[PDB]
């Protein structure tokens, strides 16, 4: 019956930036975790706290699916208990995390000759993020001891900076689309189960 | 927040924008180099202007962070790279003059023509031309005419431009807190702040002198051999107790003695090892050569080559209507883009050049994780040394027999080992006194120890004393003979070759010792040895992060350049030359002159 919409998440024409990662709530539907495998290279398919083989045996109340596009060498930063730039200012996961992380290459789609400057990521931030939190505010970062007054200059920087994907860059700098699947059990009947 | 905390943020921002701008510039330059068109020149000018500008603005901004308030010795190096202005310290009226002088002094060199005697219509240019006569002719008069024509009608035009160049750059030198332009050049080798690894600027002169004092006897014996075999070819023009005329050394300036094998070969009945016909008789191509080079590098222990190297890289001459340069170069465009441009052919020289550039690419790949300003060799002599040791190890008969080019029945005789060693010595040992003399002359001219009216007089007496080369005609204080070389007329350093030559054999001996090789050092192959690969990679990984003394110690075991491995390389040749020179005179006297 009723088949959860995983092919609006794994097949959309445009993904979101890292700092504005889309989250989609999935509930009240039967989910088969088998059309997911009908991709190909799955550069990373790590699962934390859940058996991938026994996946079509457990029931959950909510399933969350996040979508963003990062660089190739930053995929290792999406994992519980990692430090860096993406996992401190853009997207951080709790240590007691249950779910799976999926990534694959998207060079033929999200890369153009001249520069695909539509993907951004935050590089300056006063303090680290709490798990599953986003910040979409663009105010000048005060790295000095003087007020900034909202103008970029000395000791004042714009917090966001583009990727600029070109089709000749190397594997570590090529675009990668990442979808994170989250699960939880709440004080409600588990309305999400496999077939 | 402290001044050290503010510096790191600025460095991060600088790195992010610098990578992108540098990639754009490099891609435009590559597109022009593989495709000559005016539109490509226009592309290559805009990117260069944007980069140079950017860099100027960042250098101006990076001077509000005081140096004596940063204590990590990693931020300190990047700020030292950004903060140097060098040429902008001079006022606007002299900065334009310096650029005009450099451009005109380069144009006079490139656009050069020695019109021959009698017939005035015929005239000859360097590059194709006044280089073929000096490399292939066998007449004394023809060579003397070419030598003197080039010295007289290209050098006098450059004298009263170097005379202003010297002062106009000494002013810039003491405008950046130095003592002369020579110290500015030598400042690359300077290391400060790391206990047990300091290297002052003035120690380089002492080190060079002490290494040359050990090199000297082998050069003397080689010189005596060449003098005998050369006086044999020219009936009576060379004295047997004197120096060598400068116009008959094989090239225009005498930089390399490699164009003397046909006259100084030890055993002329035994041919050398050339496998070109074997490669042709097996249907070889460019892809096979590069896969053999990659196979060798993987056998050593280093990684394979990226798919980009095999997709976006031109290995053969395009031909047809596309016109492109054919100078073998190794490109590191950044962001994981590594390419090689080389117009390769089926020839053993191309086989070795492939290994040379392949080693360049590997060394570039090694330090890709370092910050942007630290992505270069430890000093100016490590990169080419790493490139050269690969070609040294890939030309041995054992390696050729392993890959099938040379038949197993081939037997190594001692009459061919001496020929190979002499051919190698005519290129490596010959250039060292030339390089040392030129650097010492330039250092004294810049410092002020050579008055303005004693330039050529000091130059030729040093040429006689150190190199054993005498001019055929007398030169007054009007010629500018040293300006006759690309590197003097276009503001490049010249000691890098000395340092690279002395570093490559240290590296080779260390790697061969790690590979448990037994026998002479010149018959060593580092193939199939992972220990040598690991020992090398330990230094290739560092980049400019650590002082070059530490990088050298990681591989060799010493903190300074040493000239004993090179002598160990040429021991059989030294014994043979001592045996052959038992009836002649070793050494030269600085009194005999062909013009009397
Ligand atoms: C994505 O959409 C295309 C368009 O029809 C389809 O061919 C492909 O099978 C889809 N892939 C997935 C995983 O749904
Ligand atoms: C070289 O340039 C010409 C003219 O700009 C162009 O038509 C051609 O495609 C270029 N070659 C390559 C390999 O891009
Ligand atoms: C210098 O800064 C780097 C960060 O760029 C840091 O990893 C390193 O620990 C610092 N040096 C010292 C001695 O703390
Ligand atoms: C030039 O260099 C000197 C010494 O490094 C420095 O004091 C000066 O501010 C620099 N000028 C500029 C604006 O680059
Ligand atoms: C590439 O590198 C891997 C890892 O060292 C090695 O196993 C493989 O044989 C190499 N060959 C290819 C296919 O490039
Ligand atoms: C090779 O060795 C033999 C035996 O010692 C000797 O007679 C011969 O002269 C040597 N040849 C050369 C070129 O040294
Ligand atoms: C390196 O080892 C391989 C495999 O044992 C062998 O085929 C090859 O001949 C060796 N190369 C050399 C130069 O000994
Ligand atoms: Zn090279």
Numbering used by the authors:
A (entry chain B): 333 to 527
B (entry chain A): 19 to 614
What does the paper behind this entry write?
Compared to BA.1, the S protein of BA.2 adopts more open conformations (two-RBD-up and three-RBD-up conformations) to bind hACE2 with a binding affinity that is two-fold higher than BA. In complex structures, all S proteins of BA.2, BA.2.12.1 and BA.4/5 (N658S) exhibit a three-RBD-up conformation. In our results, three-RBD-up conformation was observed to bind the hACE2 or mACE2 receptor. Residue N477 of BA.2, BA.2.75 and BA.4/5 RBD forms an H-bond with S19 of hACE2, while A475 engages S19 with an H-bond in the BA.2.12.1 RBD/hACE2 and BA.2.75/hACE2 complexes. N487 in the RBD of BA.2 and BA.4/5 interacts with both Q24 and Y83 of hACE2 through H-bonds, but it only forms an H-bond with Y83, and its interaction with Q24 was absent in complex structures of hACE2 and RBD of BA.2.12.1 and BA.2.75. Notably, R493 of BA.2 and BA.2.12.1 forms a salt bridge with E35 from ACE2. T500 of hACE2 is hydrogen-bonded with D355 in the RBDs from BA.2, BA.2.12.1 and BA.4/5. An additional H-bond between T500 of hACE2 and R357 of the BA.2 or BA.2.12.1 RBD was also observed. Compared with the residue N501 in PT RBD, Y501 in these four Omicron RBDs forms π-π stacking interaction with Y41 in hACE2, contributing to the increased binding affinity towards hACE2.
